[PDB]
Amino acid sequence: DRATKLLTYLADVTVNGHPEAKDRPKPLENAARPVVPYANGNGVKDGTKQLLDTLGPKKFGEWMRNEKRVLLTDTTMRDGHQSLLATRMRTYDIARIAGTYSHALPNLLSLECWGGATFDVSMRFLTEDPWERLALIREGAPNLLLQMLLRGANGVGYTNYPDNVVKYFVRQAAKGGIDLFRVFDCLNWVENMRVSMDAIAEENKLCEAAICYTGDILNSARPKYDLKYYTNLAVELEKAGAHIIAVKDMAGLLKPAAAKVLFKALREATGLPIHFHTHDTSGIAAATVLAAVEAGVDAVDAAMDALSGNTSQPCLGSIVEALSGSERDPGLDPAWIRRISFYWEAVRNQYAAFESDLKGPASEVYLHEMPGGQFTNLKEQARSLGLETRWHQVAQAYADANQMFGDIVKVTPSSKVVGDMALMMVSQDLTVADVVSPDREVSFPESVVSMLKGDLGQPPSGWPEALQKKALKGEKPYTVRPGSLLKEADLDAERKVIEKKLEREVSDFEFASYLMYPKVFTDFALASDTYGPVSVLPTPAYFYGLADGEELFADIEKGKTLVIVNQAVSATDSQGMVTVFFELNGQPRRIKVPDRA
Amino acid sequence: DRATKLLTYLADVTVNGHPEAKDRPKPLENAARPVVPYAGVKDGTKQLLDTLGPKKFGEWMRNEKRVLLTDTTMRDGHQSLLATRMRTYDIARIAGTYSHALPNLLSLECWGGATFDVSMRFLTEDPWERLALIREGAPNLLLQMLLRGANGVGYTNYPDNVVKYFVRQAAKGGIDLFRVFDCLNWVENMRVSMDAIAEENKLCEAAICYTGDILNSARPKYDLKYYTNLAVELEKAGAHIIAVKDMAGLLKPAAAKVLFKALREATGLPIHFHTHDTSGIAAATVLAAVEAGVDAVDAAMDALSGNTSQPCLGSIVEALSGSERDPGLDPAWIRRISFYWEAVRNQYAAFESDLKGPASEVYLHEMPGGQFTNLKEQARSLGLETRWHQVAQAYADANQMFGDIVKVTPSSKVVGDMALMMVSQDLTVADVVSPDREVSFPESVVSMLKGDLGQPPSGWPEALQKKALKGEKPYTVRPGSLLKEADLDAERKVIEKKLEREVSDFEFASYLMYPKVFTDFALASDTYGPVSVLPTPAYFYGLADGEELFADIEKGKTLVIVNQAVSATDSQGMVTVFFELNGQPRRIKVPDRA
Amino acid sequence: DRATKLLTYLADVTVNGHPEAKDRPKPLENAARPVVPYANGVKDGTKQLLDTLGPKKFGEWMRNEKRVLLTDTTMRDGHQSLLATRMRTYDIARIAGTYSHALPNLLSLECWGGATFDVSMRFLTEDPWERLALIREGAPNLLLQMLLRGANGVGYTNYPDNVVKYFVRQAAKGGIDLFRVFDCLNWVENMRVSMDAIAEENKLCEAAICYTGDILNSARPKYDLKYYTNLAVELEKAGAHIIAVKDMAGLLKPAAAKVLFKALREATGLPIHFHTHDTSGIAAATVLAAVEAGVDAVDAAMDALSGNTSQPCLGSIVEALSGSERDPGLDPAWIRRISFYWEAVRNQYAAFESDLKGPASEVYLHEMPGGQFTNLKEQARSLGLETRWHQVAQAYADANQMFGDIVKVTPSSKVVGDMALMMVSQDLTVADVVSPDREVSFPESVVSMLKGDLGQPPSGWPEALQKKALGEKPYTVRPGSLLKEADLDAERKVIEKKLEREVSDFEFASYLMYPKVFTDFALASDTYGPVSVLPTPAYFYGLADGEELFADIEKGKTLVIVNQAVSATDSQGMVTVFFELNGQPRRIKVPDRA
Ligand SMILES: [Cl-]
Ligand SMILES: [Cl-]
Ligand SMILES: [Mg+2]
Ligand SMILES: [Mg+2]
Numbered sequence A: 001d002r003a004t005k006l007l008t009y010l011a012d013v014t015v016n017g018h019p020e021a022k023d024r025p026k027p028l029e030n031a032a033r034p035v036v037p038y039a040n041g042n043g044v045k046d047g048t049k050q051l052l053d054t055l056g057p058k059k060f061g062e063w064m065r066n067e068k069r070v071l072l073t074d075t076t077m078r079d080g081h082q083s084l085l086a087t088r089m090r091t092y093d094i095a096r097i098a099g100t101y102s103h104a105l106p107n108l109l110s111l112e113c114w115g116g117a118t119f120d121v122s123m124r125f126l127t128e129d130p131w132e133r134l135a136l137i138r139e140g141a142p143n144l145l146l147q148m149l150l151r152g153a154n155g156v157g158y159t160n161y162p163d164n165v166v167k168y169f170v171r172q173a174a175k176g177g178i179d180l181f182r183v184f185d186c187l188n189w190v191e192n193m194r195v196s197m198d199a200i201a202e203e204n205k206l207c208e209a210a211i212c213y214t215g216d217i218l219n220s221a222r223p224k225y226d227l228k229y230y231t232n233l234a235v236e237l238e239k240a241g242a243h244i245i246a247v248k249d250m251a252g253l254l255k256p257a258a259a260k261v262l263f264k265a266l267r268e269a270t271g272l273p274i275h276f277h278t279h280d281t282s283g284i285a286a287a288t289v290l291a292a293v294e295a296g297v298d299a300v301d302a303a304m305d306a307l308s309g310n311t312s313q314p315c316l317g318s319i320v321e322a323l324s325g326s327e328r329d330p331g332l333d334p335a336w337i338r339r340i341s342f343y344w345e346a347v348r349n350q351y352a353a354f355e356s357d358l359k360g361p362a363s364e365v366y367l368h369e370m371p372g373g374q375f376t377n378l379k380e381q382a383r384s385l386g387l388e389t390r391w392h393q394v395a396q397a398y399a400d401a402n403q404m405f406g407d408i409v410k411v412t413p414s415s416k417v418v419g420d421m422a423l424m425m426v427s428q429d430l431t432v433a434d435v436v437s438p439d440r441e442v443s444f445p446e447s448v449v450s451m452l453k454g455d456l457g458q459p460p461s462g463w464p465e466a467l468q469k470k471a472l473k474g475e476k477p478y479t480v481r482p483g484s485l486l487k488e489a490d491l492d493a494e495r496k497v498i499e500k501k502l503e504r505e506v507s508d509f510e511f512a513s514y515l516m517y518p519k520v521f522t523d524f525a526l527a528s529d530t531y532g533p534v535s536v537l538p539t540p541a542y543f544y545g546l547a548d549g550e551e552l553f554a555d556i557e558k559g560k561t562l563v564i565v566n567q568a569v570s571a572t573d574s575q576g577m578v579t580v581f582f583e584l585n586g587q588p589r590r591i592k593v594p595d596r597a
Numbered sequence B: 001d002r003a004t005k006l007l008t009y010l011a012d013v014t015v016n017g018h019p020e021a022k023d024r025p026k027p028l029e030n031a032a033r034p035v036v037p038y039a040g041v042k043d044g045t046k047q048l049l050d051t052l053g054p055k056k057f058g059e060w061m062r063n064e065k066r067v068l069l070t071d072t073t074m075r076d077g078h079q080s081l082l083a084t085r086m087r088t089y090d091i092a093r094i095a096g097t098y099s100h101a102l103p104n105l106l107s108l109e110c111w112g113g114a115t116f117d118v119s120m121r122f123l124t125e126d127p128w129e130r131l132a133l134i135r136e137g138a139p140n141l142l143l144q145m146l147l148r149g150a151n152g153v154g155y156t157n158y159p160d161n162v163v164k165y166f167v168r169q170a171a172k173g174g175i176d177l178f179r180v181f182d183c184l185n186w187v188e189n190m191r192v193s194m195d196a197i198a199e200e201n202k203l204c205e206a207a208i209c210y211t212g213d214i215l216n217s218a219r220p221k222y223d224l225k226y227y228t229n230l231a232v233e234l235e236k237a238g239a240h241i242i243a244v245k246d247m248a249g250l251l252k253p254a255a256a257k258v259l260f261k262a263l264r265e266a267t268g269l270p271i272h273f274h275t276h277d278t279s280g281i282a283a284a285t286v287l288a289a290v291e292a293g294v295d296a297v298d299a300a301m302d303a304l305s306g307n308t309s310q311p312c313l314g315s316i317v318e319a320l321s322g323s324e325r326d327p328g329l330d331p332a333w334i335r336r337i338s339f340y341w342e343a344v345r346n347q348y349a350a351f352e353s354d355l356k357g358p359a360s361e362v363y364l365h366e367m368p369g370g371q372f373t374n375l376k377e378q379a380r381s382l383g384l385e386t387r388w389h390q391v392a393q394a395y396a397d398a399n400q401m402f403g404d405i406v407k408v409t410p411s412s413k414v415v416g417d418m419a420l421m422m423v424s425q426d427l428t429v430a431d432v433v434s435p436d437r438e439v440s441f442p443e444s445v446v447s448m449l450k451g452d453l454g455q456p457p458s459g460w461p462e463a464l465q466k467k468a469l470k471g472e473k474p475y476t477v478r479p480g481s482l483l484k485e486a487d488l489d490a491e492r493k494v495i496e497k498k499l500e501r502e503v504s505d506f507e508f509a510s511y512l513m514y515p516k517v518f519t520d521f522a523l524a525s526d527t528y529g530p531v532s533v534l535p536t537p538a539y540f541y542g543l544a545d546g547e548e549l550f551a552d553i554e555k556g557k558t559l560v561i562v563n564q565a566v567s568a569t570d571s572q573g574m575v576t577v578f579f580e581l582n583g584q585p586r587r588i589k590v591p592d593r594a
Numbered sequence C: 001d002r003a004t005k006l007l008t009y010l011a012d013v014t015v016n017g018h019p020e021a022k023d024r025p026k027p028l029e030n031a032a033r034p035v036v037p038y039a040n041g042v043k044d045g046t047k048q049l050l051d052t053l054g055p056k057k058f059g060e061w062m063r064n065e066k067r068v069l070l071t072d073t074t075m076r077d078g079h080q081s082l083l084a085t086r087m088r089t090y091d092i093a094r095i096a097g098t099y100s101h102a103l104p105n106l107l108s109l110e111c112w113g114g115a116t117f118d119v120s121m122r123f124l125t126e127d128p129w130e131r132l133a134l135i136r137e138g139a140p141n142l143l144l145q146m147l148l149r150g151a152n153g154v155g156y157t158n159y160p161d162n163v164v165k166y167f168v169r170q171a172a173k174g175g176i177d178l179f180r181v182f183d184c185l186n187w188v189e190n191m192r193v194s195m196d197a198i199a200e201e202n203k204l205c206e207a208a209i210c211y212t213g214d215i216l217n218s219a220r221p222k223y224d225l226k227y228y229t230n231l232a233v234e235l236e237k238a239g240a241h242i243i244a245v246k247d248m249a250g251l252l253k254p255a256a257a258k259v260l261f262k263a264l265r266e267a268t269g270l271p272i273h274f275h276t277h278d279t280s281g282i283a284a285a286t287v288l289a290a291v292e293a294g295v296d297a298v299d300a301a302m303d304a305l306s307g308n309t310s311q312p313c314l315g316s317i318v319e320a321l322s323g324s325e326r327d328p329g330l331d332p333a334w335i336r337r338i339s340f341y342w343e344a345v346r347n348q349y350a351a352f353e354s355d356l357k358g359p360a361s362e363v364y365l366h367e368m369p370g371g372q373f374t375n376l377k378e379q380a381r382s383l384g385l386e387t388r389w390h391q392v393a394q395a396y397a398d399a400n401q402m403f404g405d406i407v408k409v410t411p412s413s414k415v416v417g418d419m420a421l422m423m424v425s426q427d428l429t430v431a432d433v434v435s436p437d438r439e440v441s442f443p444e445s446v447v448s449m450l451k452g453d454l455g456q457p458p459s460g461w462p463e464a465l466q467k468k469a470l471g472e473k474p475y476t477v478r479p480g481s482l483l484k485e486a487d488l489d490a491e492r493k494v495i496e497k498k499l500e501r502e503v504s505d506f507e508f509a510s511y512l513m514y515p516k517v518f519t520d521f522a523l524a525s526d527t528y529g530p531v532s533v534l535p536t537p538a539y540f541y542g543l544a545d546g547e548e549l550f551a552d553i554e555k556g557k558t559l560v561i562v563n564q565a566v567s568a569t570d571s572q573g574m575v576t577v578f579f580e581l582n583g584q585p586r587r588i589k590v591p592d593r594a
């Protein structure tokens, strides 16, 4: 019966394709399966997880500060495929390598493996549960910290939520295995970060409060985001309970000369340790990372080679190689880094359907300031509206829209708003002058109206009045924390709603999912009752089913491995159904599914 | 009739396609054509060189505080990312834009390397015409080439007189700055080339090729002294500029700060840095080299940058913008030109590799940037795509077997040939050098160990040697000393009778270097004509039904050509294509080669 | 210019196929062009006798002639019955001259009238008069014979007297020598006019008696022997030169032939002429019984268009007679050569073949005319009925008795057809069609006949029927006496306006008969030219790529047309066809009708 459901999934995808893969490039036919590397046999060295359990978060930050070596965080399991493969990487490929990280790289600070877009995408597009994913990683890497990206008041969503929801979600994330919460607000508004940061601390976990980087601190024609802006924020966040401060350079804008100045000043403005995250869209972020290291930063993020570069993080193997033998040599075996990269390479070849057409570095990023994680999504959202051929007009409009909003931090979800505005400006051939024209009726996107009303918070100098008065068409804006206006979610009543929808009790984790993504979670749970635990399928089978005659090994459970053979597939019948003829462990099964064509 | 020959090309490729493109990826359909940006030109380095001469121009470079930039898009850039298939049409069309928009540039690397060969062999076009057109579009910038020293633009050592005659014509054809290197860094084998460039009163930039890791004490053959010594011996040889040629992108940042400081202390000549970005961090190295006072550096336009190419020009410039050493180049024009190169590049989709980004592995195999892609594909030909990571191990093993050597063109091609033989034939290094296993080497390897590409500082490993040349005596003198000085008077007669028409000195120089490729190119050019004036989508795929094509035969005549219809194949085997040339109809028969 | 119009047509059909052929079967790809037999080297014939003797005196000569006289129907009923009348002027006229030299003892060629008039214009884009003219030139020694539908002429409904008067007049100056005139219900008063118009044109009037039922069946006395001997008598006094028995459905059995023709000869002095169809598969017996009983003339089709719904086999009937007292004296080898020509001609018309396999005694149950049988089957395909065809044959017989047991022949047969088809489609019985409480909605064909428009049976239309089918009070008077005498100076103005031209009288006769069809035809002639001159493959499928074609625009002017290429469809929806016309290139545009 879990078998019957998996067979039903295999049949269906075998018969009808997968919607996400059906009209997109296919991997190569021969395709080496990814192979988990033989680990020698050495048992697992205590690492940062054991320390954190011993010291607690405050003393752990202090240990970070004091540590001479630079500490490394791998983003391959989260930001890496978010930025290069539309976040489509599956639990099957992610979980299987965790053990290897654990044995072979016991000195990593952490694995970035959760939050950001993975929460949503995992259910909506992958038909899998992000909590299963987290538990599997936890169990694979019990010596390393596991790290999520949490969007402050926007949780793992796109809009500000009631405080009690944000609090509950953080309670479940803790219980579920997150040790290190990198938490950020899209407008760098500390007031809108206080709820999350306190909730992370109440769970006695690491609150790594981020400052999003934008602009250029070494260009005095843009004083709004100068050195003081950043150092003052680090102080404000220390006062607010951070254990760690991050610099989240979401679009890869920090340049090397600026990192030398920025990190030296930061580490003079707070005693807290500093963690630097960047993207390699410019083709020079490895330089920026090395300068950060030379200037005393405590930790840096990087991605495995095979999922590094471009809009992803810069190359982990190559940064380690450059540091090797230096004073702050981080102590990681490069041969193992390259072996895990080789697994990642083979993994990634399976996701050909989700490759973008991005060819390499672009200094254009200094102009548009599109976060790495948005770049691709937005390019497609433009392809979508027939603007493929004017991508460079969209990047210019994005820069113009940014200035029109008064020069703001653009990261989820504020980047989406600037993205909508840019797309509209181009579709409709409107300049910013046109947009704010008294004489010119403009249908602003809902998200722009909503940002200008106050729903995403407050940029440090408020929203420009003229654009605002015109966007709002008379509705009054507000400048209070958006969560202070939201009715407190009635948790007991909400639980009952979804429990009736599903005719069963749900877990607290699942409720946290419902609270964040009610429709998406509902759809996923209903899909799960039909198809069973399809996350256990290897990736080609999940996206393409089984070829004629093909044999598949699946582990429904720890004992039980299902051997499944596709023996034949019928023509479509009068009732519009197709019958797939499987052998399950040498026994014949006929599974009927619809012809969805 | 210059038209008739062209139509014959457009009919032939329309019906049959182009062999280099028939079974590789097509571009998108709509395909934005590349647009030359809308714009007198400021004197730059060209005029300066003309004023000062090479020696004093090298000095002007040293004294110069700003870092000088060399753009490699027109040569290494597509060599490294597109098997060098970039066409004159797209290259010449942007030269003027460079000339007016980036007049501070030091130079354009736009010639030599694999372009001489590939231009004719795979693109049906004259590399000299390409040079002349670039000279005409960019009369204010230095044109730079890569010279393979005793190898010229080919894959083996030539007689001196053939080397001298070639350098004679390159300068006459418009080269100002010759980056010359020897593939095993043997100075005696450069002397001939560097003297010849001096004699034309052009800039000799003599390159020391980088390899290994100067900050790792367990590989000492390539220490710092080894670079500084070579610098000094090259100054003494009459260099105007010294280049560090990091052909595989091996120089790490910490290293660059030590190397460059020391080079500038060792010699007073300016220093020029070339590297590739296979590692993903070469921009860090380039910036460190600048902070250490390097006088000039190479980069490629964003759109043909990264991975096996040079690192990103726009971003490097941006990282420098406002600093003491700011190169003073307009980022908005950098971007405009990059957007052109991106549009251009989409037209070469057939030639992309499947390389997805940085690889720290380059520190293991030391494969040069502009080999990597090619050798990956030579392994898929020998059917070894499954075992690519074992090929790379062989290259590293082989390298060591050969005594640990500089792997650059053509020595790199030879470690390549040894590497792939060992994957296929399932062979170790201990089994490579073993007495009981008979093991036929590739010609290339036979050649190199007899001494045909010169001598590594140690000389070749004795046992590897006494097994490879099946008995024959190897030589340790300089290949050109033994090679007889070809009668240029005589070798000229043989090419002219083969063509039944007198050739130019430029053409003859293309004979000396590449007799059969040039010959094959020349007979193609009496059949098909000046194909190089055809836009690139037309060159590779012909004209679609209904389609309309503007072509400039000279600059005077513009031909307007419309493919109006195409018949089925007849009994005589021939297909007729119906054109409109400036409103008057034409029929062209072409064979069906299916 | 006429060349241009032809080019236009050839392009249009090459690009878009022909609506009559696109989704029907295609002849074999190799296809032997039909070949006109070379006649060894004209004896005057039956045409010269009629010019000499006059018609009354000519019927005498027929009568007294011992040998049986033969009429070949290959040109008319033959392809009307087997190929939906699609046979083209090009193929018909080409063989006339061969008949003329090879079979000079023939009585006549049935080559005009029937469905040819309609179909030549509507489906073949050609003039029936040009057709007649061409046959007249080719065979100035045989009588040309047409089928005239009395009051209906060449139409499907009764026309005004002066129109009929008119049409006959034109049909005579056009070359018809022998008119076989018949009324679809055998009503003589309604032949009156037609016959008085033929007589006044000093041509032959072969008044036809339609055969139905079975004279030797005591069970169905309505059509007994006196029914036919009295109709002869009456028709002689009406001025006939020849008495014809037209057995349109092939119902006359051989025993019935001995009796009918011995008796017909006793009743009138006029010579007799027998036409029958071979649906039963025994009609050749009926024709031979008829000969042995002294019938003066009989119809047969060339072997290759004989059998089934056509006439029986000319060659075999002649072979049957050869050497007997009534031997018709036709060379059998020439019959065969002409048949082989028609067999090649036939294969070009594959698209119009029925799937009729052969003999069917069912014809005695349903009495469908040879000519109808196939159309009515396609028509039952048209309405969804191939699965129940034998129920439709039962309906048709049942409807016949319902109308009171009548003569079924164009146009009365179309009427029974429509009725039968309805009766099935609605699962309606004879009882239900008739009963008081049952709202049947009758076809336009059914009301019109039972209102009087196609005339009167001997007994009248059944009372009950007419009352229900009608409200409109009926008419037992002769239709043409109620229809008004149309002013044909006025109507002539009408057509000459729409076509903005002086038309000839031939063409005016076509207008009067088929106003919309003639009009659509003339407009199309304007667009496309004399498409009738094209050979048949080309008319129906145009020209393959590279195919070379010869067409005789005038008689002294051959054109040479090559189709050399066909472009893809342009943004305007147009396709350009690239011709060579007499070595000079031509480009023709036509719509992509897809
Ligand atoms: Cl939702
Ligand atoms: Cl050659
Ligand atoms: Mg520290
Ligand atoms: Mg300098």
Ligand SMILES: [Mg+2]
Pocket: C061, C062, C063, C064, C065, C066, C067, C271, C295, C296
């Ligand atoms: Mg007689």
Ligand SMILES: [Zn+2]
Pocket: A079, A250, A277, A278, A279, A372, A373
């Ligand atoms: Zn990120």
Ligand SMILES: [Zn+2]
Pocket: B076, B247, B274, B275, B276, B369, B370
């Ligand atoms: Zn290079």
Ligand SMILES: [Zn+2]
Pocket: C077, C248, C275, C276, C277, C370, C371
């Ligand atoms: Zn008939």
